[PDB]
């Protein structure tokens, strides 16, 4: 039997003041933001697509979480009591974990949907809400609800005499009745850390990484499409040679039939000299892989290519597409400047070349890419859209991680540091109370923060919030 403590368990009033001000701000701001987000999505037929319906599910989860988590924990902090009976003792943490499930599974679903939007070539572009997304969301909600059931079984009101005074305490009571519930009581906080924090962080980081890798390939395609054109019919390049797609040389033979037979071989069907954009994109991706393999077999180009970031690598591939491996190797001083990361110097030197004199528009764009390491010289609607999708996913995931980490660390610290035999353990318990109430406020700040992140990252949402709130 554990000894009593030598010191008190208490929460200082100054902390109660600060924490309650934060709670009220998160509550008011979170209800307004997520309600306005939902109204934006419902009111505008232009806002009802795959991802925004998933965002609607996230926003509903935000509202559910804020309403179930903040008021009851403000009350516990100030009243230090439980007047609501056993049924509410079970229902509140049940609904609370259901709403966390909806939040994290909706975030996961959004990261997968945004990846699919970049990677799928057969996805029909348009305003529709796919059949599967409707069942996707129902499953998210059913699963979130089922996974929260142990909270409703395990929580209950117990009574104790504590140094004279009778207390009624709502908690996940020790001594659960079945083997499963006993295990849940001991593992719950590792379960929440694993399934509701680590696992969605791993899933969204994985799909975000797949998505940004794919966006890099799309950007190289768009860059060379701007500089060399996408030609779906066989044409003759500046030297007279039959070519197709994005500068894909078919043959140097003067026979159009010979070019057609090569084309049919590379595509695997009878094209009669005409291919689809998807076919040209696959051809282009192979041409890029081949150009890269050649760059890495070239002792003058490999050191430079290795040292460059992914964007500047694309500019180098761009020059190799235009003038071949041997021509690019001729820029000896410019390649050295690039390898030493003297961007502005390399940019001024490249503009003094015969290459710039012959194709100045293209060279200016490639040089801007070398100078800045950005895609700015190739900005079009597809690039603006990709930047925004990337920033949306990154920001939602990062704010999730930062907001929810404190509450998990609070529960893990108790698991790892609390020694029930220590007569001084109530100083740790008093500290954990502070971390816990902070953790609740930070977790609810996530629900409050999601509408704000969309406002700042998405021009479409920014203007939608303006119409709904500033008018």
């Amino acid at each position: 039997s554990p000894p009593p403590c030598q010191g008190p368990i208490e929460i200082k009033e100054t902390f109660k003041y600060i924490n309650t001000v934060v709670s009220c701000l998160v509550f008011v701001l979170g209800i307004i933001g997520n309600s306005t987000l939902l109204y934006i999505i419902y009111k505008n037929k232009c806002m009802r697509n795959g991802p925004n319906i998933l965002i609607a599910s996230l926003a509903l989860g935000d509202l559910l979480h804020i309403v179930i988590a903040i008021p009851i924990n403000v009350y516990k902090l100030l009243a230090e009591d439980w007047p609501f009976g056993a049924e509410m003792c079970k229902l509140v943490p049940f609904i609370q974990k259901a709403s966390v499930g909806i939040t994290v599974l909706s975030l996961c679903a959004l990261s997968i949907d945004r990846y699919r939007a970049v990677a799928s070539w057969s996805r029909i572009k348009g305003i529709g809400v796919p059949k599967w997304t409707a069942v996707e969301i129902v499953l998210i909600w059913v699963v979130s609800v089922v996974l929260a059931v142990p909270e409703a079984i395990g929580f209950d009101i117990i009574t104790m005499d504590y140094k004279g005074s009778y207390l009624r305490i709502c908690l996940l009571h020790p001594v659960q009745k079945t083997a499963f519930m006993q295990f849940y009581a001991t593992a719950k906080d590792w379960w929440l850390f694993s399934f509701y924090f680590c696992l969605p962080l791993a899933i969204t980081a994985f799909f975000y990484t797949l998505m940004t890798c794919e966006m890099l390939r799309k950007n190289i395609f768009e860059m060379l499409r701007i500089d060399e054109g996408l030609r779906l019919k066989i044409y003759k390049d500046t030297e007279g040679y039959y070519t197709i797609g994005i500068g894909h040389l078919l043959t140097k033979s003067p026979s159009l039939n010979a070019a057609k037979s090569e084309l049919d071989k590379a595509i695997g069907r009878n094209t009669n000299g005409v291919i689809t954009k998807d076919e040209a994109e696959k051809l282009f991706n192979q041409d890029v892989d081949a150009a890269v393999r050649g760059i890495l077999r070239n002792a003058k180009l490999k050191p430079v290519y290795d040292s460059l970031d992914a964007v500047r690598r694309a500019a180098l591939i761009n020059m190799v597409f235009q003038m071949g491996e041997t021509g690019v190797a001729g820029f000896t001083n410019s390649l050295r400047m690039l390898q030493q990361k003297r961007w502005d110097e390399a940019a001024v030197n490249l503009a003094k070349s015969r290459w710039y004199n012959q194709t100045p528009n293209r060279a200016k764009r490639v040089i801007t890419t070398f100078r800045t390491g950005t895609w700015d010289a190739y900005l079009n609607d597809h690039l603006k859209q990709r930047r925004e999708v990337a920033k949306t996913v990154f920001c939602l995931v990062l704010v999730f991680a930062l907001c929810w980490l404190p509450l998990h660390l609070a529960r893990i610290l108790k698991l790892t540091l609390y020694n029930q035999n220590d007569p001084n353990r109530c100083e740790l318990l008093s500290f954990l109370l502070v971390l816990d109430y902070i953790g609740i406020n930070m977790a609810s700040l996530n629900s409050c923060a999601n509408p704000i992140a969309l406002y700042l990252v998405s021009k479409r949402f920014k203007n939608a919030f303006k119409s709904a709130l500033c008018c």
Binding site: P4, Q420, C426
Partner: peptide, 21 residues
């Protein structure tokens, strides 16, 4: 909030003051 045993009245009192989570 949970505790290893009911007999740890300090932990149970802490759960009485603690967040619902």
């Amino acid at each position: 909030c949970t505790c290893f045993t009911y007999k740890d009245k300090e932990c149970v009192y802490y759960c009485h003051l603690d967040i619902i989570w």
